[PDB]
């Protein structure tokens, strides 16, 4: 929820990164995709 103190960036710094593969948001736990093609 809130940003708690995190782990020190030693092995992993990163201020940038990936974001492809039809990059979407929110839990996709329930998806009901019934043929998206028209």
């Amino acid at each position: 929820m809130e940003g708690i103190s995190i782990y020190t960036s030693d092995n992993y710094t990163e201020e940038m990164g990936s974001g492809d593969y039809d990059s979407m948001k929110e839990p996709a736990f329930r998806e009901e995709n019934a043929n998206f093609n028209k």
Binding site: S9, E15, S18, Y21, K25, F29
Partner: protein, 68 residues
């Protein structure tokens, strides 16, 4: 690579239509600017992609690891 507090995020956006079967494992990091990000290493040698921590297979992945 300077990452203090201004901008530290392991990803830009999180990937959703990425395959569960194409990843080797999950690597999770939380930066001060970004909620939660799981980054997975794609099979063989391609690169590592950011997986939405809220993706379907991730949901159950966390769940199974949790206990259920």
């Amino acid at each position: 690579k300077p990452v203090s507090l201004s901008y530290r995020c392991p990803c830009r956006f999180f990937e959703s239509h990425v395959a569960r079967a194409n990843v080797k494992h999950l690597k999770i990091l939380n930066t001060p600017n970004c909620a939660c990000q799981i980054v997975a290493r794609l099979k063989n040698n391609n690169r590592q992609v950011c997986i939405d921590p809220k993706l379907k297979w991730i949901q159950e992945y966390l769940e199974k690891c949790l206990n259920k």
